[PDB]
């Protein structure tokens, strides 16, 4: 389970966004560390806002499934904060913030090798769910953390980490869901209890198509209903100007949930681009 933490050891500081139904703030928090050594951690604090929550369950099991798998590549719960009015997850802080934002911003110093990495790590983590059989159901750039930059100077290259899915789209209302569309899967909009392995496939590659698009949405200039036509005319998403994931993207975006490759698969074809 959770490590309950006492609203009285939290500082809420700024606000860092919005996630659905949610608010993030960055925070710091008072605790008693290795050795006994007092710390004054930051922390991403993670609030469902007051109005909705009904949703407090699937909250909650979407960090909790997060945390009892461990793994370089997933973002840290810390633990809960139940106190009181509100409904708060205490995480990890992670300096850089969403990977879409970050792309947007820096745009015109990230090339193809940066790409392929990041691309690589989010399949490793991916693939780590696949084996342990655990669906995540919201992977987007908005929900990939960038933990460290590139450094071309000392070798390192950019790290990053998967935050939790969020409340699921297994409850969650029918626009809400259309409006995810490209991110999630035809068969989910159609039956949103359709949540499978399969899912996280799809969704990875209209990651990737983020990640080659400089931070841009697909399918953005679209509304709802428009989504909605997109899936029912079997359309599939543009390749980016750097195409050189084109194939990939589309392969993963497959109308066919049984056809979506392996993320092993996946990795072997990432592993072999390149000179
Ligand atoms: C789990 C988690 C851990 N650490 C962090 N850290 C973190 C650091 C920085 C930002 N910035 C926000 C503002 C940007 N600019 C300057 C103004 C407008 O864009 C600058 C960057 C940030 F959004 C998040 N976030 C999360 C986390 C959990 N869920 N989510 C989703 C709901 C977004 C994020």
Redesign the pocket.
Known sequence: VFHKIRNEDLIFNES????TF?K?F?GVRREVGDYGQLHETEV?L?VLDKAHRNYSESFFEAASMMSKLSHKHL?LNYGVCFCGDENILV????????LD?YLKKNKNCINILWKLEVAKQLAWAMHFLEENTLIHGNVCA??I?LIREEDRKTGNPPFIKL?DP?ISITVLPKDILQERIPWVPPECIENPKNLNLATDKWSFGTTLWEICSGGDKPLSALDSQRKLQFYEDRHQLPAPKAAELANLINNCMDYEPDHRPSFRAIIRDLNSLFT
């Open positions: 860092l966004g919005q996630g949610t993030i960055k991403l993670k973002v995480q990890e802080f992670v300096k850089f913030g969403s934002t908005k929900n953390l935050s969020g």
